[PDB]
Design a protein around this nucleic acid. Sequence first.
RNA 1: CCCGCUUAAUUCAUUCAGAUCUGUAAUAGAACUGUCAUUCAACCCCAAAAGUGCUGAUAUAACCUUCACCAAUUAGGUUCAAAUAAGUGGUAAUGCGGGACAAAAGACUAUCGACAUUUGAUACACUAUUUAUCAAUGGAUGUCUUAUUUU
DNA 2: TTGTTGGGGTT
Lengths: 1012, 184, 147, 108, 187, 199
Amino acid sequence: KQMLTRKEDLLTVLKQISALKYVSNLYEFLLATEKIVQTSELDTQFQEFLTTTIIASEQNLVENYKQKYNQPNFSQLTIKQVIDDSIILLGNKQNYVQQIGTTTIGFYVEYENINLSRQTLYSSNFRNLLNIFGEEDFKYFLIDFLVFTKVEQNGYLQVAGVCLNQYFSENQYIYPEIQRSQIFYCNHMGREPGVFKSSFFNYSEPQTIIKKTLLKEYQSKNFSCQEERDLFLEFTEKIVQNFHNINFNYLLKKFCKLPENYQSLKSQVKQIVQSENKANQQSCENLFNSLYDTEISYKQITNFLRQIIQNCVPNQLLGKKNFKVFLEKLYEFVQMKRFENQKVLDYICFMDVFDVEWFVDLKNQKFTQKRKYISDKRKILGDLIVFIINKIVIPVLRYNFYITEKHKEGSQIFYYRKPIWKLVSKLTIVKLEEENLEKVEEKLIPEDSFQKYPQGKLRIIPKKGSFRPIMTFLRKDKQKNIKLNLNQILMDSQLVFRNLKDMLGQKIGYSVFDNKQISEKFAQFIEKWKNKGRPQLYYVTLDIKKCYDSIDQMKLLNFFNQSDLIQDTYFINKYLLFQRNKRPLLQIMDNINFPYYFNLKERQIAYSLYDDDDQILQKGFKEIQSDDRPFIVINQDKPRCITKDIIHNHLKHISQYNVISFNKVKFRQKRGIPQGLNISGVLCSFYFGKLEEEYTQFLKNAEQVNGSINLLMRLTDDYLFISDSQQNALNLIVQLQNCANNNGFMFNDQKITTNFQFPQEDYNLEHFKISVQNECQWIGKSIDMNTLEIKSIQKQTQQEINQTINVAISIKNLKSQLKNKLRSLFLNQLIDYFNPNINSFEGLCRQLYHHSKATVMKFYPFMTKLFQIDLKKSKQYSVQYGKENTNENFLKDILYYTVEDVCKILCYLQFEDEINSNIKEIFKNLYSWIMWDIIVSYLKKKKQFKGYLNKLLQKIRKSRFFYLKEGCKSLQLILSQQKYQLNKKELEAIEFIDLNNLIQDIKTLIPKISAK
Amino acid sequence: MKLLLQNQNIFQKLKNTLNGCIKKFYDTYQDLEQMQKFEMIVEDKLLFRYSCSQSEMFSAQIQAHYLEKRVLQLTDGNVKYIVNFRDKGVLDKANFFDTPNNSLVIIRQWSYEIYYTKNTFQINLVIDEMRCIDIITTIFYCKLELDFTQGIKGISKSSSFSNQIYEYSAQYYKAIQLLKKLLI
Amino acid sequence: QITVPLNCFMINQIVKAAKENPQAHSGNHYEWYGAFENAIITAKFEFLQSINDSPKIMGKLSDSTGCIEVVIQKSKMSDELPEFVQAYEIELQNNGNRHKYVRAMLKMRKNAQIQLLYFSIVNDANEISRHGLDLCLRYLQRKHGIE
Amino acid sequence: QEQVMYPRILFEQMAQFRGKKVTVVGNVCNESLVIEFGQHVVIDNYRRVDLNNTTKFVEIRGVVLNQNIVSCEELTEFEQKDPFDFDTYSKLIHLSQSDKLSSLFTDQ
Amino acid sequence: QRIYSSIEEIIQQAQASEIGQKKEFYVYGNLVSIQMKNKLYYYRCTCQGKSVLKYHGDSFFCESCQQFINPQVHLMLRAFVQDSTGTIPVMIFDQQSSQLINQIDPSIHVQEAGQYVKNCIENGQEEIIRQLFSKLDFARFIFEIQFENKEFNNEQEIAYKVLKIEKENIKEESKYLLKKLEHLINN
Amino acid sequence: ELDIKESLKLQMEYYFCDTNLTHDSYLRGIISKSPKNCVDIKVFLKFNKIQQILKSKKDLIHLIRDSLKESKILKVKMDSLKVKRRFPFNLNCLIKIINIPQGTLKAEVVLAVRHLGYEFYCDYIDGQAMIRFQNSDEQRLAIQKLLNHNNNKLQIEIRGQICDVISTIPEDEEKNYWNYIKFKKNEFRKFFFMKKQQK
RNA sequence: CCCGCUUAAUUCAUUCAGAUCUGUAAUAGAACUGUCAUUCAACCCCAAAAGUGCUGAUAUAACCUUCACCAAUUAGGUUCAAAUAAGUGGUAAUGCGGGACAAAAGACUAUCGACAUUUGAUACACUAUUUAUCAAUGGAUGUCUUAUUUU
DNA sequence: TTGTTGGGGTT
Ligand SMILES: [Zn+2]
């Protein structure tokens, strides 16, 4: 079948598009159109540019540009004037490449912005092409065609024609959406509980004021006649009266009440706030835990919500049975995770329309066209549901509770009462005002900073022993005319620092910033390790505590103003980039557009006016590709200037007057950079790279002074050091603690999670707590020091995993969303460390096994959310899949096709293109079989999946098994001809295939994998 | 395209390279052998050519050139500079697209120059390198100019209309005074 | 960079003086008290039956003080005619070869024939008078501009 | 190709020139073609009724005879819905006759 | 009676003025090259509705009047005004743009302009709008143009907006040029 | 009681065998209609001989469960309220419409009449449309808007055209219509006679 | 399992701010009023347009089996069908009443253009709609009999 | 009288 390739030429990918009828290199376009003859003479530069240029055209026009010999091709007009004439011919058409940063006036073009693709347009090669074509053919070649020119190794740059940005693009009733996320993060609390004093339940208080305050629901355009509106207003007045007779005190008291010892905790907190001296430690910890273990549970609050609705809304407003279905769905409305939401169709699809009482029909359209009546009363049931939810359920959950998620549990929800949260607020404003932050008045801040920069905001998330803060900056002041929040202001500086970050891996210390560089360092170290002969290895792990708040303005600004890796003047360019996604080349149905092969991305960059030998001045872009597959670039006219002076002012501001708000009390940080700024993640690594580099001269040479292989990686915090010489790791720990002693930071929980054993008294580190393990667990990793291979750590219980999957499904376009969803979960982590240099074959199989087992459990909630929607009553899927048992077959379809996609991706990520195709076929079938075996053995025991679907899935797995067997049986006869000379990797794969006896049965391989 | 040029803050580069120039000059010529200084002081001959540093490469737009009297015009927003250049070899180096006018170029390396005129010195400017980075054709109305070829008269014009240009005129006056104080 | 309204006699005189005194700076701009390349003129546009020119559609402009040879264009992908000549063909053909003056903006370049860009049909005598005055005025607006 | 110069003059210049090829531009007369200038009229060679319907105007280039008689070599008309001015046209003619502007209209 | 002026005089008297001045002149130029690359409309209410709340599904509701309204489409274009001397980049507002589209095609009403352009841009019929604009090139008029020296994003800028657009009368343009040139020869 | 427990066990073993529950089959329908053939304990509480041997609900529930826990065909575990046997033991007013646009389909006139709100039967043919009702009061119910005093015309709108209708049919035509109806009815009768006999 | 009917009681507490009152030694106590703001943290990385080799083998496999819900552990049958089983862990239950057509049937000249489907086409609808008409098609619906409260 | 979804890691 059509596997994937790791080297292509854009000629093919343009030939295999639909909307294009002609594509070729300009050399053949000239030979065909007879503008030149083969035996002509042109220097190698001009001939090469003629050779690798590409042109495309929607219609074959080799005839229109045939050379009529009537008029000589002798040119006198400059290239600027010919191109002026071209844009002039374009008239009023408004989207072309040569028409970037230029506006026409009458019969005169006017350039007014910077387009760094011109330097290829007004080149000397284009002057030669104008000499060859003559103007009357040029000024039309620059319109009828699409011109790409190879400017990088493979990445073409479009210079003329239409921009591909234009190949990448009756009304109905869209039901409203219930504002769930308004309930989450409140901090208000009044004397007598209830709902807010601005809500209409308490507006200055018959039906008159209800009309005055319900201007958005009473006179909506769904209510046909005045009678419907007035009856609804009557029901709203009845709702209000029936709600104002509730003893919220008692009502809360019954189901979800404060703990039995709440007064003890209030007293303890009041004591810890009164005392002037620095209070205890374990008392505060146990106070935090006793406060966080008082959170209401879903069932109790659900009973509360039912009991508060049953006596605030008349019965016949929804009907006898619709009301009950509503009250039953309300529970699932409560227990949903943070990033989910419930749709009005979920409520409606299980309701009856005639069941309500107060309807009225103008033209008696109920019996003739019943379907129109059903639709035009669903469009009222929906509004009533949304009114009830967004005007009782949401304000109650806002005022009367506090809703958050804990730190380590994941993405679940959590309901704490209100006074308990005011308590934790006071206790944290006390525990906080002593470590880093400090209260501040308004005049302690200057006025320029006051009128230029935005304020801050702080949120608290409960953790196990203590709290955890998180700073938000999204606000922008309404007055003083500021239109940008802090990150929108620092984006330019962050671009400068990105261009700097592209160099810290080898220049001024020890850092990494992604999985590509980490995998690179691993490739190099593992190469050295297999070189010397694979000895015993040791490691060590440790991590700074509160890094972003231990760094001082002085050394930061001093390193910044005294480092030459930041030039003085920088320009900024914006462009669009088009790459090749994973879809294989569809071998040639009649609708194959660009988005089927190319991903669009809208990038920026910051280049230097110097003659840096990367010449971002001539190309316009700087990109890093992983393999030779073509890509396109087009520039844009939106450049800007930036200078180290303004970056200095920015750093000084964000490191001096960082003012953040909390509970209408203004705080100011004392030393450190705020956590939660786009610039911070690079500043921190830069600063600590300075220090760690000045302290670790012994690393650079210890490979040649005594010959000991050893690497040191370091993300923002979590160090990691692997070596063969124990003494190196020991001295490293000592030197790092020395740097911490001298410069003023300290390590978190002293968790020097080393591998060996050593007396920690000989080095004044006795307070450290060694924790000896045998599998180096870095940031979500399982580096195994027996083969030095990598993999990931996966949660292993269905609840553990369920707490981190937010399902959000809508019947609109299932086959798309779900598809990508599952696909994403297969590549979210496997794509990175599947590199074949790190792992052996069996390691690859193990990684695939484990990650498939994890992604099945991550997906499963999606399947059980699907099976709760009936795919019979919808034509879109029933017309194609059938009318009975449509669900299981739809599911079988998406599973099989996503497995084929992921199998292709893995099959090419493991090999080059030079290998035989029978090996790629075998391993194709093997990965597909492993994934299907996992999915079957996990699915053969569920309830909804046991009767029908298991037959199909079993058949599919048996098919894949037989196909594997067929391939591995045929390959030996294929090699019997000697017709292929086996290279090294191929021989290794063949030994992997024969040793494990893939001919008869896969049994020999599962023991070799399933053990974790 | 006003902001991209304006935010260069060229006056900083000019002030810093002039400080470098005066410092290097009255640091290199403190012999004060008054006879040798009298032999050095000759009319209309170059005494000192200070090539600016590397980080001071401002980029601006040509509004008008004259080739025989070696006059080039530059501008950025509100200020328009009148400068000189080495020779036509320069323009042959900076690969212009259509015409010397209406083009926006960066400046790889320029230089200050010290001349002796009637009764006093002269601080001249000479652009030694250029490269055209783009075309732009816009009718910029720079309210104020400054000439680096007409002495204190070339700068003191319009000095009362900008704190920046006022302080630059002040630095220029101080520089010529320190020059005539050292060497005379 | 700027247009100048002047009559065919002035065009002939300028092209004569320039093509007979080639010792000017090699700027394709002509020189009449400055650099110009576009012009405006009102005159009697009539066709001229040339010999089988598919790329070009030549014309002619007679006026009170001379006669020049203008040149037009045509879409190459399909040799139809633009609006500004479609309308003139329609109206001239209807009213029976009864020609009218036209107000035309045209782009003149040396070492090639004088392109024409656009024209509109005039239906009022005062136009000429206006145009006349215009030239006169603009004349001074360059003469005193050079002194 | 070939320069057929046909200047613009006034009606007194019609007698002042005493034989020359010129252009005269005015309005037609209602009653062998005769046209009004300014009052006063003048006869021509073209047929009174040959001219088209919608037109109310006239311009002719041709040789002028003694007076009240002019030869017509070329004739052009158009539909003017406005009262054609004469004072400003007279000013343009006179200032064309001037010395400071002579180099604009004709050579020499 | 009025006093007219050319383009270059306006450009001068506007590029040499203090920030905040607003003043109008009268020119005999001509419009050209109506821009199309930016958005061609904005939304308004009858009583100077500041903002009409944006919904999808084509629903709308106002707060400067406290009723449910059909939102109104005001269209503002960008074009250039020329003369025998110079070029001015001008903006054009609802009434004047409607007047233009009416003068080119009398089919559309005084209130149907914005409706027509919105329907043509949404339905997928822009070629008719494109040619409708293109047939406005070099339409001679008589302009009353306002200039104002404001400042935006804490940097100085200059803008020109259109106030009046009438049809011309050559009999007055000629008299204007006549008095101009007579005064000129008079010195 | 333990004696009561043995008595209940014996009585339930007697009343749980399908041998008696087939020729009697009083509760057999309930047992088959049960959730999993596992009827609750209160299903025996509707009896008679248990109450006289009895002399709360959960108390008697636990008592019956204890008495059943010793059975051999029944089953009791996990305090299940239901208990089941572990053996299967299987085995005069109508009008006419005219002036109709010739070529009018059925649904249009059907709904143009159905707008009235009450059922009817219509038979259309080219022009002539016989409409009949089911209740005798329907005439004067609907007359005020079929005899539209707004127009005083018996008008029905269909597909863009007005057609007339009658207020009362001559009773000779009505008799012919009733014979038509009884004729269709005997048609159906004889149709199904032949179908009963064709085999 | 399905269906109908049915769920109460003074406050567990009262941040922040203001104004009072009583006493007070710098604390305490009592009564009262006002009250969400633009609600969404950022960075790095990865994916992101409208088709099966419809699927022949590895009994050393695949299925099936148990009284609330679901999930993780034991035993017995089974060779493309089905058979009754045993532990453990986590979610879930106030009470009242109701549950012999049960099918191989015959008889019903009982009902029936207003029966009842199942296919088509036409209409109004659609984001997961419970319809109308016509056409063809023939059976459809309720009772008695193989029937006795220890039900 | 203008300028749309929610994975993985780190804090
Ligand atoms: Zn309003």
